[model samples]
Target: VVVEDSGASFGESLLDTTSEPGKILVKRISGGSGITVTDYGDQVEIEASVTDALSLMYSTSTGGPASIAANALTDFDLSGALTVNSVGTGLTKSAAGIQLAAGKSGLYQITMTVKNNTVTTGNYLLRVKYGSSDFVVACPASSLTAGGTISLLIYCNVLGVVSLDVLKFSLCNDGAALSNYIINITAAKIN
Candidate 1:
Protein backbone atom coordinates (compact mmCIF):
# COMPACT_ATOMS: atom_id res chain seq x y z
CA VAL A 1 0.00 0.00 0.00
CA VAL A 2 1.24 3.55 -0.81
CA VAL A 3 1.03 5.11 2.64
CA GLU A 4 2.58 8.47 1.61
CA ASP A 5 2.16 10.02 -1.83
CA SER A 6 4.16 13.30 -1.43
CA GLY A 7 7.89 13.80 -1.81
CA ALA A 8 8.36 14.91 1.86
CA SER A 9 6.58 11.88 3.27
CA PHE A 10 7.60 8.93 5.45
CA GLY A 11 5.58 5.95 6.56
CA GLU A 12 5.59 2.23 7.22
CA SER A 13 4.05 -0.37 4.84
CA LEU A 14 4.84 1.75 1.80
CA LEU A 15 4.37 0.56 -1.82
CA ASP A 16 7.36 -1.76 -1.99
CA THR A 17 6.70 -5.45 -1.47
CA THR A 18 10.41 -6.28 -1.88
CA SER A 19 11.33 -3.95 1.06
CA GLU A 20 11.87 -5.35 4.59
CA PRO A 21 8.71 -5.82 6.64
CA GLY A 22 7.98 -3.54 9.66
CA LYS A 23 10.54 -1.06 8.27
CA ILE A 24 9.69 2.65 7.57
CA LEU A 25 10.39 4.37 4.26
CA VAL A 26 10.95 8.10 3.55
CA LYS A 27 10.88 10.02 0.27
CA ARG A 28 12.21 13.60 -0.21
CA ILE A 29 11.32 15.55 -3.31
CA SER A 30 13.77 18.36 -4.36
CA GLY A 31 13.17 21.60 -2.42
CA GLY A 32 10.30 20.15 -0.39
CA SER A 33 8.87 21.95 2.69
CA GLY A 34 10.16 19.37 5.22
CA ILE A 35 10.08 15.74 6.28
CA THR A 36 7.31 13.94 8.19
CA VAL A 37 7.29 10.54 9.83
CA THR A 38 4.03 8.63 9.89
CA ASP A 39 2.86 5.40 11.50
CA TYR A 40 0.70 3.75 8.88
CA GLY A 41 -1.20 1.40 11.19
CA ASP A 42 -1.89 4.16 13.76
CA GLN A 43 -2.52 6.93 11.17
CA VAL A 44 -0.20 9.33 13.10
CA GLU A 45 2.41 11.72 11.82
CA ILE A 46 5.15 13.81 13.53
CA GLU A 47 6.71 16.76 11.80
CA ALA A 48 9.00 19.70 12.60
CA SER A 49 9.50 23.07 10.85
CA VAL A 50 12.77 25.01 10.64
CA THR A 51 12.68 28.80 10.81
CA ASP A 52 15.15 31.62 11.59
CA ALA A 53 13.16 32.83 14.59
CA LEU A 54 12.98 29.42 16.22
CA SER A 55 15.21 28.97 19.27
CA LEU A 56 16.70 25.53 19.65
CA MET A 57 18.68 26.21 22.81
CA TYR A 58 20.04 29.03 24.95
CA SER A 59 22.69 29.34 27.70
CA THR A 60 24.25 32.02 29.90
CA SER A 61 27.01 32.11 32.56
CA THR A 62 27.59 35.80 33.18
CA GLY A 63 26.21 36.89 36.55
CA GLY A 64 26.42 33.39 38.09
CA PRO A 65 25.25 29.86 37.60
CA ALA A 66 21.69 30.57 36.49
CA SER A 67 18.92 29.42 34.18
CA ILE A 68 16.25 30.97 31.98
CA ALA A 69 13.99 30.95 35.03
CA ALA A 70 16.37 33.26 36.88
CA ASN A 71 15.91 35.97 34.26
CA ALA A 72 12.33 36.31 35.45
CA LEU A 73 13.57 38.45 38.34
CA THR A 74 13.90 42.00 36.99
CA ASP A 75 13.93 43.78 40.31
CA PHE A 76 15.44 43.00 43.69
CA ASP A 77 13.42 43.87 46.77
CA LEU A 78 15.82 45.30 49.40
CA SER A 79 13.70 46.53 52.25
CA GLY A 80 14.31 46.07 55.98
CA ALA A 81 13.51 47.46 59.41
CA LEU A 82 15.67 49.68 61.64
CA THR A 83 15.64 51.52 64.98
CA VAL A 84 17.65 54.17 66.81
CA ASN A 85 18.92 54.54 70.37
CA SER A 86 18.07 57.39 72.71
CA VAL A 87 21.15 59.41 73.57
CA GLY A 88 20.66 62.31 75.98
CA THR A 89 24.17 63.51 75.21
CA GLY A 90 24.67 65.61 72.07
CA LEU A 91 27.14 64.67 69.27
CA THR A 92 27.45 61.05 70.40
CA LYS A 93 26.68 58.42 67.77
CA SER A 94 24.16 55.62 68.16
CA ALA A 95 24.98 51.90 68.42
CA ALA A 96 26.57 49.94 65.56
CA GLY A 97 22.93 50.49 64.71
CA ILE A 98 20.79 48.65 62.23
CA GLN A 99 22.42 46.10 59.97
CA LEU A 100 20.87 45.97 56.49
CA ALA A 101 20.98 42.64 54.68
CA ALA A 102 22.47 42.85 51.18
CA GLY A 103 22.12 39.64 49.17
CA LYS A 104 24.44 40.72 46.40
CA SER A 105 27.18 43.24 45.65
CA GLY A 106 25.95 45.84 43.18
CA LEU A 107 25.10 49.49 42.75
CA TYR A 108 21.89 50.21 44.64
CA GLN A 109 19.69 53.23 45.07
CA ILE A 110 18.78 53.56 48.73
CA THR A 111 15.87 55.49 50.17
CA MET A 112 15.95 56.06 53.91
CA THR A 113 13.35 57.61 56.19
CA VAL A 114 14.02 58.65 59.75
CA LYS A 115 11.20 59.19 62.18
CA ASN A 116 11.96 61.28 65.20
CA ASN A 117 10.07 60.32 68.32
CA THR A 118 11.79 62.62 70.78
CA VAL A 119 10.50 66.04 71.88
CA THR A 120 13.77 67.87 71.25
CA THR A 121 14.73 69.73 68.06
CA GLY A 122 18.29 69.35 66.75
CA ASN A 123 20.46 68.66 63.72
CA TYR A 124 21.08 64.99 62.90
CA LEU A 125 23.38 63.30 60.44
CA LEU A 126 22.69 59.94 58.74
CA ARG A 127 25.57 57.60 58.21
CA VAL A 128 25.99 54.28 56.39
CA LYS A 129 28.93 51.93 56.49
CA TYR A 130 30.40 48.69 55.26
CA GLY A 131 32.11 47.07 58.23
CA SER A 132 33.67 50.09 60.01
CA SER A 133 34.48 52.03 56.84
CA ASP A 134 32.07 54.72 55.71
CA PHE A 135 29.96 53.94 52.69
CA VAL A 136 27.72 57.00 52.99
CA VAL A 137 29.55 59.42 55.23
CA ALA A 138 27.24 61.83 57.02
CA CYS A 139 24.43 62.89 54.71
CA PRO A 140 23.28 66.53 54.63
CA ALA A 141 22.43 67.63 58.14
CA SER A 142 18.71 67.17 58.71
CA SER A 143 16.63 69.11 61.22
CA LEU A 144 13.65 67.50 62.94
CA THR A 145 11.36 68.41 65.80
CA ALA A 146 9.26 66.04 67.85
CA GLY A 147 7.42 63.42 65.75
CA GLY A 148 9.13 64.59 62.56
CA THR A 149 9.83 62.33 59.59
CA ILE A 150 12.55 62.84 56.98
CA SER A 151 13.49 60.91 53.87
CA LEU A 152 16.77 60.81 51.93
CA LEU A 153 17.97 59.07 48.77
CA ILE A 154 21.50 57.89 48.06
CA TYR A 155 23.31 55.44 45.80
CA CYS A 156 26.04 53.05 46.89
CA ASN A 157 27.54 49.60 46.41
CA VAL A 158 27.89 47.18 49.33
CA LEU A 159 29.73 43.90 49.78
CA GLY A 160 27.71 40.71 49.97
CA VAL A 161 30.26 37.96 50.69
CA VAL A 162 30.26 38.30 54.45
CA SER A 163 28.54 36.92 57.48
CA LEU A 164 25.67 38.47 59.54
CA ASP A 165 27.03 41.99 58.77
CA VAL A 166 27.48 44.24 55.74
CA LEU A 167 25.49 47.49 55.50
CA LYS A 168 24.85 49.35 58.76
CA PHE A 169 23.52 52.73 59.96
CA SER A 170 24.56 55.14 62.73
CA LEU A 171 23.22 58.51 63.80
CA CYS A 172 24.85 61.52 65.40
CA ASN A 173 24.23 65.12 66.65
CA ASP A 174 20.91 64.53 68.35
CA GLY A 175 20.28 65.96 71.85
CA ALA A 176 17.57 63.56 73.03
CA ALA A 177 17.57 59.84 73.78
CA LEU A 178 17.43 58.02 70.38
CA SER A 179 16.56 54.73 72.03
CA ASN A 180 13.15 54.16 70.43
CA TYR A 181 13.17 56.14 67.21
CA ILE A 182 12.38 54.51 63.86
CA ILE A 183 14.63 54.46 60.79
CA ASN A 184 13.37 52.76 57.65
CA ILE A 185 15.76 51.92 54.81
CA THR A 186 14.78 50.59 51.39
CA ALA A 187 17.18 49.70 48.58
CA ALA A 188 17.03 48.59 44.93
CA LYS A 189 19.87 47.24 42.78
CA ILE A 190 20.78 49.33 39.69
CA ASN A 191 23.28 46.95 38.15
Candidate 2:
Protein backbone atom coordinates (compact mmCIF):
# COMPACT_ATOMS: atom_id res chain seq x y z
CA VAL A 1 0.00 0.00 0.00
CA VAL A 2 1.26 3.47 -0.95
CA VAL A 3 0.87 6.05 1.86
CA GLU A 4 2.74 8.81 0.02
CA ASP A 5 -0.42 10.88 -0.65
CA SER A 6 -2.15 10.18 2.66
CA GLY A 7 -4.00 13.08 4.36
CA ALA A 8 -1.37 13.23 7.08
CA SER A 9 1.31 13.61 4.41
CA PHE A 10 -0.13 16.96 3.29
CA GLY A 11 -2.08 18.09 6.32
CA GLU A 12 0.01 20.57 8.30
CA SER A 13 2.99 18.63 7.14
CA LEU A 14 6.36 20.35 7.11
CA LEU A 15 7.57 19.20 3.75
CA ASP A 16 10.07 20.37 1.18
CA THR A 17 8.50 23.50 -0.23
CA THR A 18 9.63 26.67 -2.00
CA SER A 19 8.45 30.20 -1.23
CA GLU A 20 6.80 32.52 -3.73
CA PRO A 21 8.05 35.90 -2.42
CA GLY A 22 7.40 38.56 0.23
CA LYS A 23 5.98 42.08 0.67
CA ILE A 24 4.96 44.70 3.30
CA LEU A 25 2.15 47.16 4.07
CA VAL A 26 1.89 50.09 6.52
CA LYS A 27 -0.70 52.72 7.48
CA ARG A 28 -1.05 55.55 10.01
CA ILE A 29 -3.85 57.63 11.42
CA SER A 30 -4.46 61.21 10.25
CA GLY A 31 -3.11 62.65 13.51
CA GLY A 32 0.23 60.87 12.97
CA SER A 33 0.14 59.58 16.56
CA GLY A 34 -0.89 56.06 15.45
CA ILE A 35 0.51 53.44 13.08
CA THR A 36 -0.60 50.01 11.75
CA VAL A 37 0.94 47.13 9.79
CA THR A 38 -0.67 43.85 8.67
CA ASP A 39 0.45 40.67 6.98
CA TYR A 40 -1.91 38.81 4.70
CA GLY A 41 0.44 36.19 3.33
CA ASP A 42 4.15 35.42 3.44
CA GLN A 43 6.24 33.32 1.00
CA VAL A 44 9.82 34.10 1.89
CA GLU A 45 11.40 30.91 3.20
CA ILE A 46 14.93 31.47 1.99
CA GLU A 47 16.05 33.57 4.93
CA ALA A 48 13.27 33.23 7.48
CA SER A 49 15.48 32.10 10.35
CA VAL A 50 18.39 34.51 10.80
CA THR A 51 17.38 37.49 8.67
CA ASP A 52 14.60 39.88 9.69
CA ALA A 53 11.04 39.13 8.55
CA LEU A 54 10.34 42.59 7.17
CA SER A 55 11.80 44.10 4.07
CA LEU A 56 10.20 47.51 4.51
CA MET A 57 8.92 48.23 7.99
CA TYR A 58 6.60 51.09 8.95
CA SER A 59 8.35 54.30 9.99
CA THR A 60 7.36 57.76 11.25
CA SER A 61 8.75 60.63 9.22
CA THR A 62 7.88 63.15 11.95
CA GLY A 63 5.87 63.45 15.15
CA GLY A 64 5.74 65.66 18.32
CA PRO A 65 3.61 67.25 21.00
CA ALA A 66 1.59 70.35 20.30
CA SER A 67 0.68 72.70 23.15
CA ILE A 68 -2.91 72.66 24.23
CA ALA A 69 -4.99 75.29 26.03
CA ALA A 70 -4.52 73.17 29.18
CA ASN A 71 -3.89 74.79 32.53
CA ALA A 72 -0.60 74.48 34.41
CA LEU A 73 -1.86 73.43 37.86
CA THR A 74 -2.77 69.81 37.09
CA ASP A 75 -0.49 66.80 36.58
CA PHE A 76 -1.32 64.03 34.08
CA ASP A 77 -0.93 60.28 33.74
CA LEU A 78 -1.19 57.89 30.81
CA SER A 79 -4.42 55.95 30.52
CA GLY A 80 -6.01 53.47 28.10
CA ALA A 81 -4.05 50.67 26.41
CA LEU A 82 -1.35 50.15 23.73
CA THR A 83 -1.23 47.10 21.49
CA VAL A 84 0.64 45.56 18.45
CA ASN A 85 0.09 42.30 16.55
CA SER A 86 1.88 40.30 13.81
CA VAL A 87 2.09 36.80 12.16
CA GLY A 88 5.07 35.17 10.41
CA THR A 89 7.98 32.68 10.69
CA GLY A 90 11.46 34.17 10.28
CA LEU A 91 14.52 34.82 8.00
CA THR A 92 14.74 31.27 6.73
CA LYS A 93 11.12 30.99 5.68
CA SER A 94 11.29 34.26 3.74
CA ALA A 95 13.75 36.37 1.78
CA ALA A 96 14.87 39.90 2.57
CA GLY A 97 13.72 41.26 -0.82
CA ILE A 98 10.76 39.11 -1.71
CA GLN A 99 7.55 40.32 -3.34
CA LEU A 100 4.25 39.88 -1.57
CA ALA A 101 1.22 38.11 -2.93
CA ALA A 102 -0.69 40.16 -5.49
CA GLY A 103 -3.07 41.70 -2.92
CA LYS A 104 -2.02 40.21 0.45
CA SER A 105 -0.30 42.10 3.30
CA GLY A 106 0.25 42.44 7.07
CA LEU A 107 -1.34 44.64 9.75
CA TYR A 108 -0.06 46.59 12.80
CA GLN A 109 -1.88 48.99 15.10
CA ILE A 110 -1.05 51.31 18.07
CA THR A 111 -3.30 53.30 20.42
CA MET A 112 -2.86 55.38 23.57
CA THR A 113 -4.73 57.64 26.00
CA VAL A 114 -3.78 60.27 28.57
CA LYS A 115 -5.56 61.40 31.73
CA ASN A 116 -5.05 64.03 34.41
CA ASN A 117 -4.39 62.58 37.84
CA THR A 118 -3.37 65.76 39.62
CA VAL A 119 -5.64 68.55 40.74
CA THR A 120 -3.46 71.22 39.12
CA THR A 121 -4.06 73.29 36.00
CA GLY A 122 -1.81 74.62 33.25
CA ASN A 123 -0.69 74.20 29.63
CA TYR A 124 0.87 70.80 28.92
CA LEU A 125 2.07 68.68 26.04
CA LEU A 126 2.30 64.87 26.07
CA ARG A 127 4.82 64.20 23.33
CA VAL A 128 4.35 60.79 21.74
CA LYS A 129 6.81 59.51 19.13
CA TYR A 130 5.54 56.87 16.68
CA GLY A 131 8.83 55.84 15.05
CA SER A 132 12.41 55.80 16.32
CA SER A 133 13.65 58.33 13.75
CA ASP A 134 12.27 61.04 16.10
CA PHE A 135 10.92 62.52 12.91
CA VAL A 136 7.26 62.11 13.87
CA VAL A 137 5.71 63.36 17.12
CA ALA A 138 2.17 64.03 18.28
CA CYS A 139 1.06 66.23 21.13
CA PRO A 140 -1.66 64.42 23.02
CA ALA A 141 -4.69 66.20 24.42
CA SER A 142 -3.67 68.56 27.18
CA SER A 143 -5.42 69.70 30.35
CA LEU A 144 -6.63 73.15 31.20
CA THR A 145 -7.25 72.79 34.95
CA ALA A 146 -7.82 70.32 37.77
CA GLY A 147 -10.04 67.35 36.87
CA GLY A 148 -9.38 68.03 33.19
CA THR A 149 -8.65 64.88 31.24
CA ILE A 150 -8.81 64.10 27.53
CA SER A 151 -9.10 60.90 25.54
CA LEU A 152 -7.12 60.07 22.39
CA LEU A 153 -7.73 57.23 19.95
CA ILE A 154 -6.58 56.19 16.45
CA TYR A 155 -6.89 53.32 13.91
CA CYS A 156 -5.28 52.24 10.61
CA ASN A 157 -4.83 49.34 8.14
CA VAL A 158 -2.19 48.14 5.67
CA LEU A 159 -1.74 45.49 2.92
CA GLY A 160 1.34 43.80 1.43
CA VAL A 161 4.13 41.26 2.11
CA VAL A 162 7.32 41.89 4.12
CA SER A 163 9.74 40.87 6.91
CA LEU A 164 9.72 43.53 9.60
CA ASP A 165 12.17 43.80 12.48
CA VAL A 166 9.94 44.95 15.36
CA LEU A 167 7.86 47.79 16.80
CA LYS A 168 9.33 50.53 19.00
CA PHE A 169 7.98 53.61 20.83
CA SER A 170 9.24 56.59 22.84
CA LEU A 171 7.70 59.44 24.80
CA CYS A 172 9.27 62.87 25.17
CA ASN A 173 8.50 66.57 25.62
CA ASP A 174 7.79 68.97 22.77
CA GLY A 175 10.19 71.49 24.28
CA ALA A 176 7.43 74.12 24.47
CA ALA A 177 5.18 71.74 26.35
CA LEU A 178 5.83 69.90 29.63
CA SER A 179 9.41 68.79 29.27
CA ASN A 180 9.52 67.26 32.75
CA TYR A 181 6.58 64.98 31.99
CA ILE A 182 8.31 63.19 29.13
CA ILE A 183 8.15 59.39 29.28
CA ASN A 184 11.14 57.26 28.41
CA ILE A 185 11.17 55.18 25.23
CA THR A 186 10.37 51.47 25.12
CA ALA A 187 10.93 48.75 22.50
CA ALA A 188 9.59 45.24 21.80
CA LYS A 189 10.05 42.60 19.10
CA ILE A 190 6.74 41.95 17.34
CA ASN A 191 6.38 38.80 15.28
Q: Where is model 1 more than 4 Å wrong at Cα?
A: 1-103, 131-160
Which ten residues in a row are the worst by lDDT in model 2? 74-83
lDDT of 2 by residue, 1-191 (tens): 11134555333232222242232222221211122234335531222221112222211211222332233222212121111222333211122212223222233223222333332333333332222322223443334432212222221111332323222222322323332222222221122
Error of 1 at 141 (Å): 8.8
Candidate 2 TM-score versus the reference = 0.23
Best prediction by lDDT: 1
Each candidate's TM vs. the true structure? 0.35, 0.23
lDDT of 1 by residue, 1-191 (tens): 34646677454334543466675555322322233556567555666432101001111211111311211211111221221321111111213322323433334344444444443455445555545455432223344343332233333333443332444544433444443444454433334
Give one clash count per candidate, in the order shown.
7, 58
